[PDB]
Design a binder for this molecule. Structure first.
Ligand SMILES: CN(Cc1cnc2nc(N)nc(N)c2n1)c1ccc(C(=O)N[C@@H](CCC(=O)O)C(=O)O)cc1
Ligand SMILES: CN(Cc1cnc2nc(N)nc(N)c2n1)c1ccc(C(=O)N[C@@H](CCC(=O)O)C(=O)O)cc1
Lengths: 287, 287, 287, 287
């Protein structure tokens, strides 16, 4: 039994200098990321109650934690992500399949949510494109199981992944942490020349996937000269999202009514053109 | 040399009872189709001068003629399309490479642009999912060259293609037309139970590609229960777009300035939520 | 009265995981940068006494503080740079001319040493080639007075300057610091998204010059695809170095004997080939 | 179409009292001359086979024949030079640009390679700085086409060129040799007070340039008090090298693989400090 109309949540995050109708945002490339693989998208708002998130959680089929620059500890974003993370562990544990994806900031958050500790250190990775240095465990992985061979070889040898993060979790800090070592299979690592860090990982026992890099940029962001845009960079963004949405199709939650489904969808919101200056071509702002 | 920043135009279409800011439209699924294979999009307005279309044509890297309900002979859409068609035939003849894509109404328009005649017949195909019946000629073909072998087997045997057309050209009328027979390679056909019609074609000597069916619907349109949304239907939409945007990467046109590029991009426009009532989840309306 | 045998010191910086004979290092591109403009170079070791540094200061004609990855307050590099900075202000205040150059990390240190504060902000500039957005003040600047007008034009319009840092001082923060504002003339800025940052400056009242970017990379480092290597990128590195060595030729210091001079020169050291792996083709490692 | 990663060979020459690891040498000033104009350098070993020289020749983008004191007729140097000269004449004649630079001894070698005869006579120029006495033919020359007007004036009137040769070809012996007069355009002459000799030349029909004097010495050698080290002497070394490296960028040769490229580079070798004693501050010795 499969859900061919998956709806996935994307978490909004705190705007730095917030105003009314401008309290949180979502970069449109994360919306496009998921839509292209045949999902619809609901924005998850920031300063809501446990019950409101619980109602939405039970309605949607997966959730993505996007990149950005807010606090992993004290932000509306971190708090809402922690609520989704416990709900997802509950559901999966009970036997309902519910996938979670973390990108950049979202990857960092997951290391903090699962280990209890802030384990991040500085890496020179603020706007650089890298290949993936796959680990010994990529072989039987879930994430990359459905990628073409030629694409796997291009990922290993071509600079296909966009990194814009001032922090990483070194492989040394990761491996020294008992909780993370047991919880997550590391699929790729990378180096800035000085420190080797985790770049792609998936939970052993849960459908939880995370990248330190930004798969959604290659097809959808054109603002910066280090964003990969070769043909295999484009297929990378499709195959990454294809895997995740195929995860969401294993989840059978639905909204109570088509009416409530219709009001929650991203189609209710119009993004602003931010690409003349911002790293993001388009950005959704929310009250 | 290839162009790793392709920009493709999508033709806007006359609104049936037009009002200011609502004289023409583009369904957002055509925009999402192109962006997802790593292209940016420019809307091509309907009531412009020959010189303005020339200037736009010389700035962008390909064009798409979308489906819809407008006149093939007397609409602003049909006029603009004829101008782009003629500019494309000139550029390619001279040795530039400029690709043209027609979908559904746009496929029908191309049969008329090339043959000079309307040769369409009624088919009982106004809302149905169909496989494709490939011709022997699919083996040499340009369009399907990079499709995975399993995806080609799935298109042959599974209902992955969205048909929503009341008209078609039967294979018999296509064949009896000397101009069409000489200009286009037929790649797939289909039947409505009574009439066998051309569903996919490409020009022998030009990068002009057309489908009677709607490849953009599978991943981006959720308004009708017949629209295919299986995992291989999602891959069909990506491989179709990936081929076309790879053709556009062979074209080296650029805008005269980045400020002029920035003003033309679809990012400057905000679509309306039309999915509760119309065939399209979102629609861009233009003055 | 000029010194046509200038010798310039280049400060070594702390090796992260130091070992005997590998306590500090200098990228060879900084040596080559100064030699090509007709200077000899002395490496300035870290973790030496005040008196040793004062002896060396009194013998050489100028000093460069090179880019790199070390801490701004606790490194042997930062403490030696503070010493040379204080010696240079004393000598210039007294009436002796002694020029100081800071590149990247060096530029950072200069803002700290003069302001007494840490004013850096994050920018996605870990690997990007940028033009310079000159200020009105480049006009009668000392640094650029002798550059060819065409080179100045190329510099304003082509990506000729290598950036590989991730912390910059924004123009707002520079202007808001009274001590920096009164001390340094900003010659060029660049923009990372919304953040406009100081990229080249020179002290109003002292021969102290600093670039956020790496002039020495264009001619000498071949390890990353974005490093500028066009003909005008090559002339930029020569003219930048030529200006600074022409500053050192105004200083009349010499070593107490030709034997002491000979033992201090970089010719006593052999670099390692570090290019297959690191950002530098060659590096000098020191005990 | 240009090569922005040019690599140029520098010929090593026979050590006089040869020993293992000391059979040939290159003075580091030739390597520095070229790197400063944005080339990488490969040392060309002396006792190699014709096939080995062919393989290298086809991988590199130009070659320089340095000065020195080895036989023009029986050395490993003069043999390797003959092979490169013949390969370069072949390549240029076929339509493949390949530039050759001779300095001092290398200039004398070229007069022998092209005329078939030794036409040199003693001049009193073993260690003196001279201006260049330009011919009428400098005006449309290739070598000096991009030099600043003011530098060409300084070269005419200031002692900017290092002469350290006891042999020269007089302008009278030059002119009387039919082969030389038809193959080379004389750009400058000089006199020792009794003999007027050729000091700079370029081939009319090939990219072959030669100086009797040593452009590389002004910026990089500090062993003799005659060596010119004024600002404009420093610019002379940069502009000479700049010309020749720009010639090498017209050559599209590459190595078969990056690994083979990496093993051939001068970065693999370390020079010795020879400055206390010899004409050269630093020298590369080879087995
Ligand atoms: C929306 N519509 C009804 C329709 C048509 N013309 C109108 N014209 C006006 N002035 N006002 C209207 N309300 C109006 N409505 C349509 C839609 C498609 C086709 C049509 O023939 N489409 C092609 C292409 C199919 C496709 O592209 O979707 C076909 O073969 O069916 C005709 C009318
Ligand atoms: C160092 N030296 C002495 C010298 C020459 N040949 C030798 N050959 C052998 N086998 N062994 C020696 N010890 C030896 N020594 C030299 C140096 C330059 C010239 C010479 O004629 N050079 C050219 C080129 C000038 C230059 O390139 O510097 C000239 O015109 O003077 C001759 C002898």
């Amino acid at each position: 039994k499969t859900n061919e109309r998956p709806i996935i949540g994307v978490l909004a995050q705190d705007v730095f200098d917030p105003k009314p109708d401008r309290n949180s945002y979502i970069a449109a490339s994360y919306v496009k990321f998921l839509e292209s693989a045949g999902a619809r998208v609901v924005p998850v708002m920031i300063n809501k109650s446990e019950d409101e998130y619980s109602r939405l959680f039970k309605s949607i089929n997966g959730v993505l934690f996007p990149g950005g620059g807010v606090s992993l500890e004290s932000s509306g974003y971190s708090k809402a992500a922690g609520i989704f993370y416990r709900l997802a562990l509950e559901a999966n544990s009970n036997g309902d399949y519910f996938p979670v994806w973390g990108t950049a900031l979202g990857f960092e958050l997951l290391t903090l949510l699962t280990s209890g500790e802030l384990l991040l250190s500085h890496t020179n990775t603020s706007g650089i494109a890298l290949p993936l240095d796959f680990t010994e465990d990529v072989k039987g992985s879930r994430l990359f199981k459905e990628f073409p061979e030629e694409l796997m070889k291009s990922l290993a040898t071509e600079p296909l992944t966009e990194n814009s993060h001032q922090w990483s979790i070194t492989t040394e800090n990761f491996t020294a942490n008992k909780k993370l070592k047991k919880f997550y299979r590391v699929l790729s690592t990378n180096t800035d020349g000085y420190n080797k860090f985790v770049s792609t990982m998936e939970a052993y026992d849960f459908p939880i996937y995370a990248t330190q890099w930004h798969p959604e940029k290659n097809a959808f962001e054109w603002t910066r000269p280090y964003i990969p845009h070769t043909p295999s960079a484009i297929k990378t963004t499709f195959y990454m999202a294809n895997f995740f949405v195929n995860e969401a199709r294993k989840n059978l939650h639905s909204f109570a009514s088509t009416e409530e489904e219709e009001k929650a969808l991203i189609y209710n919101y119009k993004p602003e053109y931010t690409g003349i200056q911002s790293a993001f071509e388009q950005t959704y702002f929310f009250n």
